[PDB]
Swiss-Prot record, chain A:
UniProt name for this protein: DNA-directed RNA polymerase subunit beta'
GN (gene name): rpoC
Family: Belongs to the RNA polymerase beta' chain family.
Assembly notes: The RNAP catalytic core consists of 2 alpha, 1 beta, 1 beta' and 1 omega subunit. When a sigma factor is associated with the core the holoenzyme is formed, which can initiate transcription.
Function: DNA-dependent RNA polymerase catalyzes the transcription of DNA into RNA using the four ribonucleoside triphosphates as substrates.
Range of the intact protein held here: 403 to 452 of 1407
Curated annotation (Swiss-Prot), chain B:
Full protein stretch here: 1194 to 1243 of 1342
Role: DNA-dependent RNA polymerase (RNAP) catalyzes the transcription of DNA into RNA using the four ribonucleoside triphosphates as substrates.
Lineage: superkingdom: Bacteria
Gene expressing this chain: rpoB
List of residues that carry N6-acetyllysine: K7
Applications: Co-administration of salinamide and rifampicin or salinamide and myxopyronin suppresses the emergence of resistance to both antibiotics.
Family label: Belongs to the RNA polymerase beta chain family.
Protein modification: Acetylated on several lysine residues in the presence of glucose.
Organism in which the protein naturally occurs: Escherichia coli (strain K12)
Summary of subunit composition and partner proteins: The RNAP catalytic core consists of 2 alpha, 1 beta, 1 beta' and 1 omega subunit. When a sigma factor is associated with the core the holoenzyme is formed, which can initiate transcription. The rRNA transcription and antitermination complex (rrnTAC) consists of RNAP, NusA, NusB, NusE (rpsJ), NusG, SubB, ribosomal protein S4, DNA and precursor rRNA; S4 is more flexible than other subunits. In pull-down experiments interacts with CedA. (Microbial infection) Interacts (via flap domain) with Escherichia phage lambda antitermination protein Q; this interaction renders bacterial RNAP resistant to transcription pausing and allows it to read through termination signals.
Name of the molecule in the record: DNA-directed RNA polymerase subunit beta
UniProtKB/Swiss-Prot annotation, chain C:
Family, as annotated: Belongs to the RNA polymerase beta chain family.
Known role: DNA-dependent RNA polymerase (RNAP) catalyzes the transcription of DNA into RNA using the four ribonucleoside triphosphates as substrates. Resistance to the antibiotics salinamide A, salinamide B, rifampicin, streptolydigin, CBR703, myxopyronin, and lipiarmycin can result from mutations in this protein.
Subunit structure and binding partners: The RNAP catalytic core consists of 2 alpha, 1 beta, 1 beta' and 1 omega subunit. When a sigma factor is associated with the core the holoenzyme is formed, which can initiate transcription. The rRNA transcription and antitermination complex (rrnTAC) consists of RNAP, NusA, NusB, NusE (rpsJ), NusG, SubB, ribosomal protein S4, DNA and precursor rRNA; S4 is more flexible than other subunits. In pull-down experiments interacts with CedA. (Microbial infection) Interacts (via flap domain) with Escherichia phage lambda antitermination protein Q; this interaction renders bacterial RNAP resistant to transcription pausing and allows it to read through termination signals.
Range covered out of full length: 697 to 796 of 1342
Organism (species): Escherichia coli (strain K12)
Name by which UniProt lists this protein: DNA-directed RNA polymerase subunit beta
Top-level taxon of the source organism: Bacteria
Record's comment on post-translational modification: Acetylated on several lysine residues in the presence of glucose.
From Swiss-Prot, chain F:
Keywords: Acetylation, ADP-ribosylation, DNA-directed RNA polymerase, Nucleotidyltransferase, Transcription, Transferase
Family per similarity comment: Belongs to the RNA polymerase alpha chain family.
Residue ranges of the region described as Alpha N-terminal domain (alpha-NTD): 1-219
This protein's name: DNA-directed RNA polymerase subunit alpha
Transmembrane segments: none
Length: 50, 50, 100, 50, 229, 219
């Protein structure tokens, strides 16, 4: 039902839960890293410049 | 010939115009290139891949 | 349309087979965005044939990439045309010139 | 690539520029000058550093 | 401390769409501040009235086509989206468009109303291409602000609109481009008094004498917070 | 709701020191964060009024190019440090103070001739250090009330006038959401003042001025 309360539940669950991001191919270990997620309206994954 | 055609209009023969940032009303230092580029929407939209 | 092209569109859009092309010269008699009927002039009319050439334009139809390929008219009622003129613009084409 | 361009543009110095040669009591004031438009970013100046 | 307050000394309505208005006097820097703040406010928050829904007699979906019309239903919907009208003291209105015969279909064919005013009657909706051809549609116009896409609207309506009701994306914002030019004024035999001249190109629904006042009211009411500390 | 724009409620004052704070506004309509933040900056940084030193007369020196002895720092540095002095002057346009000091030791702002009508907000402001047994200085400091930050464009010596008390104001906008949309703006404003005016009230003044300029059109 994507209830508006469910979005509050998601904003509480995702608070401190890391997510692993890895691009294919991943030649070296720096290609897989953990990030603290933040919700975004769109459908693209927001990545940091550095 | 591009310069001659720009001269026919009242446009600057330099090809670069000064712009103003919409957020602060300030003028960008040094002119910037502005024109009409033909852009195409490639058939790789995100909603087919997320 | 593209503002800056190379003039190759006037051929690529025509020979693609996606735009409706006037088979013979004549004057447009009726258009309804589906069927354009042309009164082909008697100079190229067969003596026994109808003397009036239809063009059932193709509307929204799925392509191999799940896109629409409808053709829309560009000529006006009563406008004269000559054989080879583009009557209805196909997808990515407008006024007989390719426009992606 | 973009960030380094910004830093290269910000710290570069020009011979003659607006707000040249004055004395600034500290870095904060310098920033104010730029945002008030009284000085150019590449202007040569003496600021008290700590 | 010598600040003076600006007054709308003059307004020049050069056209039905383009206008200029001068605010004088203004002290140092206020010309830039007022010009850019009011430009942003006028571009973003100005309410207008735009088409919201369409319902044509014999069509089912926007991707279909009407018999005897030069323009597909999609192009008719786009042309209707380009229509700009005024409404007098109402939140919504339903206008009927009845027309027949060979020729164009212009906005004048819409059943005119005392409270409904069309900025450009020469707007063409579609072209009829048969003697007996005729289209009847019930256009719906709503007030608002900003841009509301049709996808967002129906998911916020929370009810299933009936078959045959087509929804267009409404661009309520009636202004197109706002420019501000700052120049000195001969006031009190003293210089550094900027005369802010705002030139705006609109659709013609609103008169600047009210647009600038509404923008200023919005700015002041938002500014109430920072003085409420 | 065609005239019902969202009004923010300040999440905090977020004060970090007596001079600087982190006033945050939340939430604001998209495109309203900058419209307010840049306007407040443009008011505070260049139009705020205040009293500041603009002219100085040191004893027996014609220009800062001349570096009189007896003082550890040079006359140019003395002028910049005097420019750094923050003053609160009550009910006068311009005043002429006199600072006189003697003996081996630094010169501090507490030594000025306090008229009682004049309030030096930072008596601990160091002026310079005297470097002789007989080292004595006396100077006439001119203060004037005005607006903004007047540069050196204009036995007197001119100094840049920091009438506006705001040492620095910087603002940011960031994403904020309500139960159904994540497009709203949260405005984080930071300002550091000279200390004559507390920051929390300074912005109170700034919007004030701006609101006045809007008076003739708002209904």
């Amino acid at each position: 039902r994507e209830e508006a309360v469910v979005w509050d539940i998601l904003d509480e669950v995702i608070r401190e839960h890391p997510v692993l991001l890895n691009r294919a191919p991943t030649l070296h270990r720096l290609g897989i890293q953990a990030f603290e997620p933040v919700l975004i309206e769109g459908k693209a994954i927001q990545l940091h410049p550095l | 010939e591009i310069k001659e055609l720009l001269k026919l209009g009242d446009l600057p023969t330099s090809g670069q115009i000064r712009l103003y940032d919409g957020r602060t009303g300030e003028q960008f230092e040094r002119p910037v290139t502005v024109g009409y580029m033909y852009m195409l929407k490639l058939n790789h939209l995100v909603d087919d891949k997320m | 349309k593209p503002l800056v092209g190379t003039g190759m569109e006037r051929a690529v859009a025509v020979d693609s087979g996606v735009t409706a092309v006037a088979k013979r010269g004549g004057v447009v008699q009726y258009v309804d965005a589906s069927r354009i009927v042309i009164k082909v002039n008697e100079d190229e009319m067969y003596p026994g044939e109808a003397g009036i050439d239809i063009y059932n334009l193709t509307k929204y139809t799925r392509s191999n990439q799940n896109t629409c390929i409808n053709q829309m008219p560009c000529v006006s009622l009563g406008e004269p045309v000559e054989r080879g003129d583009v009557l209805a613009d196909g997808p990515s084409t407008d006024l007989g010139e390719l426009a992606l | 690539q973009d960030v380094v361009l910004g830093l290269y543009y910000m710290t570069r110095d020009c011979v003659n520029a607006k707000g040249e040669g004055m004395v600034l009591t500290g870095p904060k004031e310098a920033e104010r000058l730029y945002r008030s438009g009284l000085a150019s970013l590449h202007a040569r100046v003496k600021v008290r550093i700590t | 401390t010598e600040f003076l307050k600006p007054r709308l000394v003059d307004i020049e309505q050069v056209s039905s769409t383009h206008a200029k208005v001068t605010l004088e006097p203004l002290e140092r820097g206020f010309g830039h501040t007022l010009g850019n703040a009011l430009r942003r406010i006028l571009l973003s928050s100005m309410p207008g009235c735009a088409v919201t829904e369409v319902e044509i007699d014999g069509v089912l979906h926007e991707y279909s086509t009407k018999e005897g019309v030069q323009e597909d239903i999609l192009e008719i919907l786009l042309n209707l989206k380009g229509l700009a009208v005024r409404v007098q003291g109402k939140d919504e209105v339903i206008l009927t468009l009845n027309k027949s015969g060979i020729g164009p279909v212009t906005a004048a064919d819409i059943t005119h109303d005392g409270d409904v005013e069309i900025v450009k009657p020469q707007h063409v909706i579609c072209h009829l291409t048969d003697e007996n051809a005729s289209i009847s549609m019930r256009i719906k116009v709503q007030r608002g602000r900003g841009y509301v896409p049709a996808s967002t609207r129906i998911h916020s309506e929370e009810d299933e609109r009936p078959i045959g009701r087509l929804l267009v994306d409404a661009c309520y914002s009636p202004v197109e481009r706002i420019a501000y030019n700052v120049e000195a004024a001969r006031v009190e035999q003293r210089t550094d008094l900027d005369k802010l001249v705002i030139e705006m190109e609109t659709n013609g629904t609103i008169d600047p004498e009210e647009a600038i006042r509404r923008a200023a009211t919005i700015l002041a009411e938002q500014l109430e917070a920072f003085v409420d500390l």
